[PDB]
Amino acid sequence: DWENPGVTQLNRLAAWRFAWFPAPSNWQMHGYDAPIYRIIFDGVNSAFHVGYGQDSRLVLRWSDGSYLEDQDMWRMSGIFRDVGFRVVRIENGLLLLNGKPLLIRGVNRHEHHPLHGQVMDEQTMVQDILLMKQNNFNAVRCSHYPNHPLWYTLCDRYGLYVVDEANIETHGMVPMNRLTDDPRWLPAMSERVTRMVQRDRNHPSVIIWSLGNESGHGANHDALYRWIKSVDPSRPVQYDIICPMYARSIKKWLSLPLILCEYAHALGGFAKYWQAFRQYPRLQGGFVWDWVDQSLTEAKHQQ
Amino acid sequence: DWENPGVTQLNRLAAWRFAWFPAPSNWQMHGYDAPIYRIIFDGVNSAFHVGYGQDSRLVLRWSDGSYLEDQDMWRMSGIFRDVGFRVVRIENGLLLLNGKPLLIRGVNRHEHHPLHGQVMDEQTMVQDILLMKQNNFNAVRCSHYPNHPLWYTLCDRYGLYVVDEANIETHGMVPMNRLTDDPRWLPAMSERVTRMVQRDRNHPSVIIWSLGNESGHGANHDALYRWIKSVDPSRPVQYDIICPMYARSIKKWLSLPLILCEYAHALGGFAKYWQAFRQYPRLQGGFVWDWVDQSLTEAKHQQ
Amino acid sequence: DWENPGVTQLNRLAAWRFAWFPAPSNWQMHGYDAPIYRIIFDGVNSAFHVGYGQDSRLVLRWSDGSYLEDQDMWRMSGIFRDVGFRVVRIENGLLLLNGKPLLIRGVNRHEHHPLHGQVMDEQTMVQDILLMKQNNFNAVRCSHYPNHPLWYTLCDRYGLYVVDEANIETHGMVPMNRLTDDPRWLPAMSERVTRMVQRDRNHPSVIIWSLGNESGHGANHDALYRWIKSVDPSRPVQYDIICPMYARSIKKWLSLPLILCEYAHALGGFAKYWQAFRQYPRLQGGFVWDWVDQSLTEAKHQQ
Amino acid sequence: DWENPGVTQLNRLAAWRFAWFPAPSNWQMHGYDAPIYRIIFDGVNSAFHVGYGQDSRLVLRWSDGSYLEDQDMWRMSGIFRDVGFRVVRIENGLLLLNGKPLLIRGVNRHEHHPLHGQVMDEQTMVQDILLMKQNNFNAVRCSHYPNHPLWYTLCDRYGLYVVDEANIETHGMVPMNRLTDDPRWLPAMSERVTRMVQRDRNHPSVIIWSLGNESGHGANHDALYRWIKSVDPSRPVQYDIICPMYARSIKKWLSLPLILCEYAHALGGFAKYWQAFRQYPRLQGGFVWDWVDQSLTEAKHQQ
């Protein structure tokens, strides 16, 4: 069943002894392969087999859904894991938050552990939120895939803006829009986006829904965009918001609100980027790539 | 595989000896059950088994996709079947066709044969188009499901407006929006709508894309609506256009262009309906239900 | 100077012995003519002569500006007269007031006195506000011309919604749009509307700006409409809102939010009108014509 | 009458022996003062006295309307002067001309004569149109004030795009928006814009209506903008189009279609400007300042 985009799930509802064969932890960390750069099953990579499901980060190593996860990270597989009053609107073409203009001093954060790997632990969440807030960061973007549910609770208790990311991105396929302009791949992206929205709609920290890093002009992506819009009218969806890819250009995306989903790779041009953010009303900020390495003072001074 | 909405198709690409067991023609017509009121497989009801598919009118008798076909017709199953210059826009809230206001003197037509049943034959198409044009009918709506491809060729050679209908309707489920507000059913509706749009985008006779008769407020329906919009920007999509259900009210759908997808059941109130069509700019016409029985002069005089 | 629309005012800034010759009170009440059905000069009819001005209800009997006052009333002339937190928007095509849908149980009120005439007295204001509130009236429309400034203070202290009316209406000219599609009359309407907006922008009771009863398709009217919009973005302007003239039709104005600026002349059809108001979301209410005669229990029960 | 903005005209309908006193030609050219840098009266500067009028370029030297003519030119006064099928729209935020994207290779042209001065002669029009077309110029902007009517006929016979400019600009008043946010000056700007629109609506060469060079945020300007829009729906109005003032920034006006009404003063940065025009879809071109001095090969190569 892990070869056809049509077969998305089987008997999947709404949102340990191990053995390895040729055909919360990672089995590539204990060593079984070479890493390459109502029961609930949160954080299962690729496909697994009561029912079947291939929606990862929402057991086989390769699956049909792996083509929609063309993000830059380490490739493991296995079992990874186990209300407020605010308004965010796009009135008058400006990102308004509770009546005041919103400035996004955000940073992209990966779900990474130095020892375990992609598995997440609670203490790291604390020393990450504290480090972010101490360095003038007011927003965090859960890079590529949604984070652990406890992260959103910590963010909305400590007061941190969260931009939720759907696990949909094709940076390796040529062209990139091959899998997003094809109706055959619409069910997989729908199952990826709708479950994330259902899981994370009740978090005041979540302020922006993100479809993907970037995969094409649209067609399938925007379908989920305003599926979120009509399903969750309170939060804007970005892909309302245009998100350039490492814009140097800013002219091109302006001449088509703007939030730099990926900018200032880690940090040249930071001063010009933040001068642009402060001056230009529709340049409401961006997210620094990335928070942690996949193995700071300048950002604090700039923000 | 015919029990889960997630399993839509298997190895299905883009768009005779028979044996009956307890578990182009209809096997219920020769008599095997009680009717109830690259190879290409056009017109296969329910699910069938190289690959698998349950998208009917786009072999088992009951399937998972039968819940989306809650239309009023005879229930058979089996194998049923084997460019112009015009602009239609919604500029200024009015349905414009080539710069002139569009008046829809349409009628709903079923794919029905007195002897064969739901199987379609070519001569009937001719004596139906001729009868429609002789009775001042300028539009035809392919009721419930898309019609045979030759119908669109005959319509665009003889000059008849066609409103394409996607096979999606829930008139029996309580509430009706149960299957349209549930993300679990989005892949099936997507596979139903996208294949129809891919098959019938290259017909000048097709002027309006219709999502369904009526099934709920939206959520899943509108996703396909503007998936068509962004995939086929030339034609409007109706469900741009509001389509009342047998409006008596017209006030309610006005106070939310309007085309009566179902009106004047066959014919009381026809004079008032057509006076409303002639006077009111946004009441651009409707479709008479139905063209043929499922076993005329007044319409000719009114239009 | 009282013959040319171009001459609007002279030395006019931003907002008693009498003698009669052939060429706060009314000189037609004491008897001098036949009635026909920084210093501040509030309520001076027609034109008068330091400077010159012809903007009445914002001394000659006939003037150039009298053509824009083709309302139904008694024709006198002379000297007639001497902050809250709420949001009103048209989000999603619905009249929203502080987040809740707004129902207008309003009545049209004239500035009339049984003895003095068009002169206004303070006690009458009190026994009018009390009578309106006791009869389930929550809104008042200052018919034709703006009312005395103390009226708005009484309304926003007692909590009564006010729709401000600009003194612009041509119900006698054939066609009515003769004076509104002619650019020669734009300065007069601009001077009429801008001064009213400047005078009454700081009243929380004022919730809707009204251009005129009805005078034509637009051209000059809508100019003032969104001059108010860009000058006072907080309040909607009606003429955002469509105001039918004594609609019986409601179909025609729906098929073009709706508030009946003139309906239920005093009272047939009141039950149907209020059933329409309660059922139909975009029919948000209306104003009863009129509050007082120019010489009640049913309205209380209906609202 | 030449001191009050309210007095715009007297008895003015819709669109030689000389003596000098202390209180088609220019009287400052023959020498009477120091230049400073149904009858029809076309091109009369300031105010003049049957009737009165102060709308110049649509006899006293200084008038009330001179405050709205704060453009850069020589100050003279006196008597200066005596259908096609195309669609221009702003569909999808892009300037569309007959279905194709519009690139404006325009230049700003003054109504200037080396000997006469601001008086215009027919031959100069010919050697100006020919020189413009030979140097890859496809558009011309009538700087500050509308040009002689024969210019539009020559342009639409020779096929040259024309952007009509209303004589409204305050570059000397501090702040500039003093005269455009004040309702007292609305009648003068209305009389200036409406007469130009009435005079030049029937020219296929005219494709864009321009309110002014730049005078403020709006208030009074936009009123005329969509007075033109509702009076002449065929042509866009710019001030639909954002026109930066000598943008170096382009970021700021993008982050608020764009046409550079004033750019490349005569020529540094021309290569970058035209690279921006070619690459960026919403940067549809600009106008070179100026065509002629008020006493070329690089532009030809760049366009």
Residue numbers in the entry:
A (entry chain D), B (entry chain C), C (entry chain B), D (entry chain A): 15 to 29, 58 to 65, 87 to 100, 140 to 151, 159 to 167, 188 to 211, 330 to 486, 497 to 505, ...
How does the study describe this entry?
3D cryo-EM density maps for the native ESIBD and the plunge-frozen control sample were obtained with a resolution of 2.6 and 2.3 Å, respectively. The three-dimensional (3D) map obtained from our data shows the structure of the adsorbed, gas-phase protein ion, which is remarkably similar to the structure obtained when using conventional, plunge-freezing sample preparation. Differences are observed at the protein surface and in the relative arrangement of the subunits. Native ESIBD led to a compaction of about 10, 14, and 20% along the long, short, and intermediate principal axis, respectively. The size of the central cavity is decreased by 40%. Local resolution plots indicate that the core regions of the subunits are highly ordered and resolved at below 3 Å, showing information on the side-chain level. On the basis of the close match of experimental and MD structures, we conclude that the observed change is mostly driven by dehydration, as it is the only effect considered in our MD simulations.
Here, we reveal the gas-phase structure of β-galactosidase using single-particle cryo–electron microscopy (cryo-EM) down to 2.6-Å resolution, enabled by soft landing of mass-selected protein complexes onto cold transmission electron microscopy (TEM) grids followed by in situ ice coating. Here, we present a 2.6-Å resolution cryo-EM density map of the tetrameric protein complex β-galactosidase, obtained from a sample prepared by in-vacuum deposition of a mass-selected, gas-phase protein ion beam onto a cryo-EM grid. Native mass spectrometry (MS) is based on native electrospray ionization (ESI), in which intact proteins and protein complexes are transferred gently from solution into the gas phase by the application of low electrospray potential, using low flow rates, aqueous solutions, volatile buffers, and, where appropriate, addition of membrane mimetics. To enable a detailed comparison of native solution structure and near-native gas-phase structure, soft-landing native electrospray ion-beam deposition (ESIBD) of protein ions directly onto cryo-EM grids has been suggested.
